[PDB]
């Protein structure tokens, strides 16, 4: 309930989200069939894998 305290907590939260976002993007597809190279290779023929 202390505004200065809350700001301290946000400095921490702001750094936490900067990494959480880089980390969660590793599982995000980008119009791709999969965010996983291993799964792209395993279930797709080579001519399609490069596009994914």
């Amino acid at each position: 309930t202390n505004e200065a305290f809350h700001k301290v907590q946000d400095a921490v939260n702001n750094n936490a989200q900067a990494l959480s976002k880089l980390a969660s993007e590793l599982s995000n597809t980008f119009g791709a069939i999969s965010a996983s190279i291993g799964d792209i290779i395993q279930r797709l023929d080579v001519l399609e894998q490069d596009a994914q």
């Binding site: 990494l19 959480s20 980390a23």
Partner: protein, 52 residues
């Protein structure tokens, strides 16, 4: 060691995830003991700011 199989199975640190992400968290510049030395120097500077 705590992100390795030779450690507690319960570790879920976002730091452990860095070994896969290719991300690294860097250490702080001062350490707690030097920061404490700098503010203990301020405490010893109290009494006082008068006498010009």
């Amino acid at each position: 060691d705590d992100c390795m199989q030779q450690g507690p199975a319960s570790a879920r640190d976002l730091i452990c995830a860095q070994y896969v992400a290719g991300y690294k968290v860097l250490p702080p510049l001062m350490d707690v003991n030097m920061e404490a030395a700098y503010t203990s120097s301020l405490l010893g500077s109290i009494a006082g700011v008068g006498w010009t």
